[PDB]
Amino acid sequence: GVKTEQEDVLAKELEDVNKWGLHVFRIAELSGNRPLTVIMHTIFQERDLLKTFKIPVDTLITYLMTLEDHYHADVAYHNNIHAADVVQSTHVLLSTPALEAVFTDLEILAAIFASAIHDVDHPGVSNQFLINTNSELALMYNDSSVLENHHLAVGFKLLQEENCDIFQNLTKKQRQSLRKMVIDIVLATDMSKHMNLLADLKTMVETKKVTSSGVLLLDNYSDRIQVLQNMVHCADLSNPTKPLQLYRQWTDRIMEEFFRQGDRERERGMEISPMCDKHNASVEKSQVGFIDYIVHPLWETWADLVHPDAQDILDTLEDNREWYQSTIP
Ligand SMILES: [Mg+2]
Ligand SMILES: [Zn+2]
């Protein structure tokens, strides 16, 4: 009843769980492709969420394994490893000094649970592809945040499988509040909402208030949920802020997934989506564009909100940006 030698190496890697730049791909290999299960378990133990919400440990493990099984192993980017990465990145962002004692246990549970379910059952093609092909998913969700609606529906539906209801001991009031927050967070992961989220985060930085203790003041639901939505959005767009050996693995995976969508579009004579044409691609120029127009404006605004807690993350982002610029053919 002590861990095997593979289990010990996994445990030593999981000591980095509170650090930006966790070896998540190594944890995926060591856990037998269970990165989301072991990282969620570690985070739930670390934050004492099993005791606070009276979650039976067997129910937690059964749900986490079920959730992880509904991420597609054949999808190169939007898989259980990406879910695990966004969970661990949200975990680190929640621990930022400028947010110490700001958020309740329920809000923390919401942000982490939202991160874990936020891409579940992703088929490895975009909303636009599902809409243009008249897919069943697009029909059910009236072409509106199709994947993000689906992620939420599956994440909640899986609570009803045998010994999977991790919220069985929460009051109705707790469950209604958790549910609304998880829905507001995951629907905010739709990139179509990015510009509005960023405008609202900028507006909050301009009218920012801190207590005499130096920590962010958020006294209404609108402001608290906006910060959690931008936090998980930041975790979702965190690849270019990681050490370059990690960023480059994520870039290889997203480009594999985009090129596979491009191949499916070309074989069916559909217009090939941006960045999805493997015969007409500038991976390096794309990353510099993504950083310049999307990732840097978001993380620059986040860094202002929690000044100076995010300086080393913003510095890594600017270094990764210069590295991709310097490799443009
Ligand atoms: Mg998504
Ligand atoms: Zn995602």
Swiss-Prot record:
Name the chain's protein: 3',5'-cyclic-AMP phosphodiesterase 4D
Q: Which residues bind Mn(2+)?
A: 119
Q: Which disease is it linked to?
A: Genetic variations in PDE4D might be associated with susceptibility to stroke. PubMed:17006457 states that association with stroke has to be considered with caution. Acrodysostosis 2, with or without hormone resistance: A pleiotropic disorder characterized by skeletal, endocrine, and neurological abnormalities. Skeletal features include brachycephaly, midface hypoplasia with a small upturned nose, brachydactyly, and lumbar spinal stenosis. Endocrine abnormalities include hypothyroidism and hypogonadism in males and irregular menses in females. Developmental disability is a common finding but is variable in severity and can be associated with significant behavioral problems.
Residues binding Zn(2+) 1 are 82, 118-119, 236
Name the residues that bind AMP: 78, 119, 236, 239, 287, 290
What residues does Zn(2+) 2 bind to? 119
> For this protein, what post-translational modification is recorded in UniProt?
Long isoforms that share a conserved PKA phosphorylation site in the N-terminus are activated by PKA through phosphorylation. Isoform 3 and isoform 7 are activated by phosphorylation (in vitro), but not isoform 6.
From which source organism is this entry?
Homo sapiens (Human)
Its function, per the record, reads: Hydrolyzes the second messenger cAMP, which is a key regulator of many important physiological processes.
Quaternary assembly: Homodimer for the long isoforms. Isoforms with truncated N-termini are monomeric. Isoform 3 is part of a ternary complex containing PRKAR2A, PRKAR2B and AKAP9. Interacts with PDE4DIP. Identified in a complex composed of RYR1, PDE4D, PKA, FKBP1A and protein phosphatase 1 (PP1). Isoform 5, isoform N3 and isoform 12 bind RACK1 via their unique N-terminus. Binds ARRB2. Interacts (via N-terminal region) with SHANK2 (via proline-rich region); the interaction is increased in a PKA-dependent manner.
| Family per record | Belongs to the cyclic nucleotide phosphodiesterase family. PDE4 subfamily.
Catalytic-site annotation from UniProt: 78 (proton donor)
Q: Which domain of life is it from?
A: Eukaryota
